[PDB]
């Protein structure tokens, strides 16, 4: 009964995993860097307390259905005793060079009932022949090892990220490849299919794999999300984030992000494990937007996931269970006339979530829908409160969840406005999510939790919005866990065009160490799109830290 491209059985089961974990752990875990350069010393790999069973337990307790593990990241250090390199745990002090992290994690996923997956970085900064054909054969030999010796692999991840320069066996060169042709993916893809016929291939930047990136690391996919791409030709950013309405291939998007600002463990980020409200936001913008959530939990130098991350994951899984515990549509009278479905609760009913699912076994069909609630005898249009322009009511696909201000309503109407073919709605749901407040245990809410906060480097932090903003003040809170990167001087810029621009500040945080209270920066209202905070000397370290920041508006 189909309509446009349809997913394979593998792609259906993957989609139903809903959330699974990423785990990043490499030599740069020990150098406090997001990337390793390729000459990090394997002697660094010496955790005091490694336990892959803890990783699996933590992930399972956050509601993850599997784990994708960095068997090898960009620096090229291998987490399993490959036959093809010495740059691996064969030559680390951990278990006297006799350990295999891929094995222990595979076993632990098995023990905890989690699916297991591997990330094998195509870009390799250690290998002397990177960018030459000999590295391609090395890559495949290693991939053969991972898909032969560790049981069932649910996904294989080929990062598109490439920074050009690396140690490269001592050459210290910057090397350029043609990403469309260098890795020779088709021969590699055949091997994957042969060794692991149930495995889904994620790739970005070249030959289409079974899954696609969503074009950002922030943890969202488009409010419009077609699980389609075309098989051939270049993929624009817009196609990653929103998919392609008439794409000739089912290539569903995977929403990847970290539970911390960085992918790897950093001590200064222990205070910034994303809050419950931020993760719920990500949930609604991944699982709630026809995607899966790939949430990264990094391993600390001691070989364990940090307890902050663990506690937050549990609070997250708990809240998701609470929001969706009671489908209010279940007791209601539901009927469909034409393109209109009315859920009649029979009495005034309080809710703030709507959920629809298409039966995507038969493809993705809905292009546009409407939501109305009958409030005091009058129909009122609802919209997606998480979408800034438009009502956000376009595609549905695997699952679409719509948040809106809580209403007290006797009926809700769901209308399929536009569709490719006759829609097959497999499920409809209505729910009352509880208030997200700071005092929820382990929620970790901060004033900055849902600001788009990132750094450029350790003098400078930046904030930005989607729309343009009239900013009347800015506040800085020093770190309260430890004082390592406390900011003493500060200068603060605003901007409308990303060109850094205009200066608000010049100051000095007074007695900020012996008195870590909120610091307020005074300035005339600026219209701005971006803020820019400079650390002008850092009290005890090399990366500026903060407890929290607040941006006030008109």
Distances (CA, A) of 465 to 80, 203, 221, 438, 497: 42, 29, 17, 23, 12
Nearest residue (CB) to Na ion, 213 versus 490: 213
Rounded Cα distance, 281 and 226, in Å:
20
Distances (CA, A) of 539 to 457, 485, 516: 17, 6, 13
Please state whether beta strands 460-477 and 519-534 pair in parallel, antiparallel, or not at all (unpaired): antiparallel
Q: How far is the CB of 228 from Na ion (least distance, A)?
A: 13
Angle between helices 101-112 and 52-61 (to 10 degrees): 40
Q: How far is the CB of 349 from Na ion (least distance, A)?
A: 24
Q: Which stretch binds Na ion (CB under 5 A): 75-83, 175-183, 272-280, 485-493?
A: 272-280
Q: Which stretch binds Na ion (CB under 5 A): 26-34, 274-282, 420-428, 454-462?
A: 274-282
Nearest residue (CB) to Na ion, 147 versus 487: 147
Nearest residue (CB) to Na ion, 449 versus 486: 449
Q: How far is the CB of 439 from Na ion (least distance, A)?
A: 10
Let me know how many helices (H) and strands (E) the chain has, helices first: 8, 22
Nearest residue (CB) to Na ion, 277 versus 352: 277
User: Is there a contact between 305 and 299 (Cβ–Cβ < 8 Å)?
Assistant: yes
- Quick one: which of 407, 423, 523 has its CA closest to 473? 523
What character string, x for contact with Na ion (CB under 5 A) and - otherwise, covers 467-506? ----------------------------------------
Rounded Cα distance, 469 and 529, in Å:
6
Nearest residue (CB) to Na ion, 191 versus 417: 191
Burial label, 213 (beta-carbon count in 10 A; 0-12, 13-18, 19+): buried
- Quick one: which of 84, 85, 82 has its CA closest to 101? 82
Rounded Cα distance, 233 and 412, in Å:
43
Residue showing tokens 């929001």: 323
Q: How far is the CB of 531 from Na ion (least distance, A)?
A: 21
Rounded Cα distance, 213 and 358, in Å:
22
**Breaks in the chain after residues, C-to-N cutoff 2.5 Å:** none
Nearest residue (CB) to Na ion, 2 versus 434: 434
- Quick one: which of 5, 73, 7 has its CA closest to 40? 73
Q: Label residue 362 left, alpha or beta by phi (over 0 means left) and psi (-120 to 50 means alpha).
A: alpha
Q: How far is the CB of 449 from Na ion (least distance, A)?
A: 7
Nearest residue (CB) to Na ion, 338 versus 405: 405
Nearest residue (CB) to Na ion, 435 versus 497: 435
* DSSP structure string for 48-74: SS--HHHHHHHHHHTT-SEEEEEEE-T
Nearest residue (CB) to Na ion, 122 versus 303: 122
Joined together, the tokens standing for residue 40 give: 């990090």
Q: How far is the CB of 376 from Na ion (least distance, A)?
A: 29
| Size of the residue set binding Na ion (CB under 5 A) | 2
Nearest residue (CB) to Na ion, 436 versus 526: 436
User: Is there a contact between 46 and 95 (Cβ–Cβ < 8 Å)?
Assistant: no
Q: How far is the CB of 319 from Na ion (least distance, A)?
A: 12
- 421 is an interface residue for Na ion by CB under 5 A: no
Rounded Cα distance, 44 and 301, in Å:
9
User: Is there a contact between 319 and 280 (Cβ–Cβ < 8 Å)?
Assistant: yes
Q: How far is the CB of 516 from Na ion (least distance, A)?
A: 23
Q: List the beta bridge partners of residue 338.
A: none
Joined together, the tokens standing for residue 546 give: 């903060």
Nearest to Na ion by Cβ — which residue?
277
Nearest residue (CB) to Na ion, 234 versus 497: 234
Nearest residue (CB) to Na ion, 209 versus 313: 209
Rounded Cα distance, 458 and 449, in Å:
20
Q: How far is the CB of 282 from Na ion (least distance, A)?
A: 14
Site for Na ion in 427-466 (CB under 5 A): 436
Burial label, 467 (beta-carbon count in 10 A; 0-12, 13-18, 19+): exposed
Q: How far is the CB of 275 from Na ion (least distance, A)?
A: 8
Nearest residue (CB) to Na ion, 187 versus 422: 187
Residue showing tokens 């969503």: 214
Nearest residue (CB) to Na ion, 342 versus 386: 386
Q: Which stretch binds Na ion (CB under 5 A): 29-37, 155-163, 275-283, 515-523?
A: 275-283
Q: How far is the CB of 48 from Na ion (least distance, A)?
A: 37
Q: How far is the CB of 315 from Na ion (least distance, A)?
A: 13
Q: How far is the CB of 188 from Na ion (least distance, A)?
A: 11
Choosing from 15, 142, 196, 277, the residue that interacts with Na ion (CB under 5 A) is 277
Q: How far is the CB of 178 from Na ion (least distance, A)?
A: 20
Footprint of Na ion on this chain (CB under 5 A)?
277, 436
């Amino acid at each position: 009964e189909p309509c446009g491209p349809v997913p394979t059985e593998n792609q259906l089961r993957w989609q139903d995993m809903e959330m699974y974990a990423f785990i990043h752990y490499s030599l740069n875990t020990y150098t406090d860097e997001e990337w390793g350069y390729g000459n990090e010393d394997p002697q660094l790999f010496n955790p005091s307390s490694l336990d892959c069973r803890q990783w699996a337990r933590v992930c399972k307790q956050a509601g993850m259905r599997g784990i994708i593990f960095t068997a090898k990241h960009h620096c090229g250090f291998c987490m399993w005793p490959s036959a093809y390199t010495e740059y691996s745990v064969k030559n680390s002090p951990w278990k006297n060079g006799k350990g295999d992290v891929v094995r222990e994690l595979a076993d632990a996923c098995r023990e905890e009932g989690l699916k297991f997956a591997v990330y094998l970085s195509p870009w390799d900064r250690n290998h002397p022949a990177y960018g030459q054909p000999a590295y391609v054969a090395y890559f495949r030999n290693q991939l053969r090892e991972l898909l032969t010796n560790y049981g069932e692999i649910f996904e294989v991840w080929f990062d598109g990220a490439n920074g050009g320069d690396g140690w490269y066996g001592g050459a210290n060169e910057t090397r350029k490849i043609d990403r469309t042709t260098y890795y020779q993916w088709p021969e590699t893809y055949k091997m994957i299919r042969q060794l692991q016929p149930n495995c889904l291939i994620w790739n970005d930047g070249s030959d289409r794999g079974d899954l696609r990136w969503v074009g950002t690391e922030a943890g969202n996919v488009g409010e419009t999300n077609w699980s389609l791409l075309n098989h051939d030709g270049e993929v624009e950013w817009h196609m990653l984030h929103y998919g392609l309405e008439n794409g000739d291939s089912w290539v569903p998007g995977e929403t990847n992000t970290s539970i911390r600002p960085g992918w790897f463990y950093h001590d200064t980020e222990n205070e910034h494990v994303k809050s419950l409200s931020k993760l719920m936001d990500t949930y609604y913008k991944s699982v709630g937007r026809n995607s899966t959530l790939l949430l990264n939990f990094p391993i600390a130098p001691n070989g364990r996931i940090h307890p902050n991350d663990s506690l937050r994951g549990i609070a997250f899984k708990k809240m998701i269970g609470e929001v969706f515990r009671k489908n209010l549509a279940e007791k209601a009278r539901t009927q469909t006339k034409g393109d209109e479905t009315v859920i009649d609760f029979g009495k005034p009913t309080t809710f703030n979530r709507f959920l629809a699912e298409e039966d995507i076994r038969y493809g993705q069909r809905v292009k546009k829908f409407l939501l109305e609630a009958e409030i005091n005898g009058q129909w009122q249009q609802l919209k997606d409160a998480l979408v800034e322009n438009g009502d956000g009511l376009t595609t549905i696909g695997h699952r679409r969840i719509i948040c809106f201000p809580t209403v007290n309503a006797t009926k809700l109407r769901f209308t399929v406005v536009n569709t490719k073919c006759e829609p097959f709605i497999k499920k409809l749901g209505v729910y009352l999510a509880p208030e997200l407040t700071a005092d929820i245990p382990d929620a970790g809410e901060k004033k900055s939790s849902n600001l788009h906060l990132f750094f450029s480097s350790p003098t400078q932090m930046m904030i930005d919005w989607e729309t343009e903003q009239t900013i009347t003040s800015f506040r800085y809170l020093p770190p309260q866990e430890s004082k390592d990167g406390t900011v003493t001087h500060y200068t603060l810029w605003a901007s409308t065009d990303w060109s850094n621009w205009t200066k608000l500040a010049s100051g000095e945080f007074s007695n900020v160490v012996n008195n870590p209270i909120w610091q307020t920066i005074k300035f005339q209202p600026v219209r701005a799109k971006i803020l820019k905070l400079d650390a002008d000397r850092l009290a005890t370290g090399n990366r500026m830290a903060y407890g929290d920041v607040e941006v006030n508006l008109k």
